[PDB]
Amino acid sequence: QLRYEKFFFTVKMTVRSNRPFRTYSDVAAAVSHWDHMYIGMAGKRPFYKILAFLGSSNLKATPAQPEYHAHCEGRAYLPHRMGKTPPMLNVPEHFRRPFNIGLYKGTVELTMTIYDDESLEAAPMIWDHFNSSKFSDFREKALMFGLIVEKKASGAWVLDSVSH
């Protein structure tokens, strides 16, 4: 049941916090609120989770109240075992929710797009966009977003399933 979904993706993220996050763990805890009362395309949720995770890894504090931004775009393959994925249309969805994780509270705003790519031309593995994927603990970080990843034979991470 192992598959490789090829897709185009765009993720625009803005995180607003009362104070600067001290660790990536804080950033992940906040960004993972993006799909609280989720009403987006069910079939796309696993992928959006990945994109939110990716965006969170590339958030940068706006030059010179703290605000963070990330914008990531491209094509990639995703190895997973969630079964055949329903067709994915190029229809942008928006997710704007609040978060309160202790010392930090604010909001996360994500506009994402993901739709099937048939280009059949060389496309990198989504995981390769994650610098943190080169370590075994990438597992723990992915789980912060409700993602269960595992590395099969010959390395390479595979999205086994969503935790919920």
* CATH superfamily of the 1-164 domain: VSV matrix protein (3.10.460.10)
Residue 48 burial (C-beta neighbours within 10 Å; 0-12, 13-18, 19+):
buried
Q: How far apart are CA 156 and CA 118, in angstroms?
A: 22
How many angstroms separate the CA atoms of 5 and 79, rounded? 7
The approach used to solve this structure was: X-ray
Per the listing, tokens 């269960």 go with: 148
Residue 53: burial class (beta carbons within 10 Å; 0-12, 13-18, 19+): buried
What is the spatial distance between Cα 95 and Cα 144, in angstroms, rounded to a whole number? 17
Q: Which residues of 117-126 are buried (b: 16+ CB within 10 A; e: fewer)?
A: beeeeebeeb
Distance CA(134)–CA(149), nearest Å, equals: 13
Q: What is the DSSP secondary-structure string of 29-64? A: HHHGGGGTT--S-GGGHHHHHHHHHHHHHT-EEPP-
The domain spans of the chain are: 1-164
SS3 131: helix
Resolution for this experimental structure (Å): 2.0
In whole angstroms, give the CA distance from residue 164 to residue 153.
Answer: 25
Taking only Cα atoms into account, the Rg of the chain, rounded to an integer number of angstroms, comes to: 15
In the chain the first and final C-alpha atoms are separated, in Å, by 19
Angle separating helix axes 24-31 and 45-57, nearest 10 degrees: 150
Closest listed residue to residue 26, CA positions, set 125, 80, 132, 102: 102
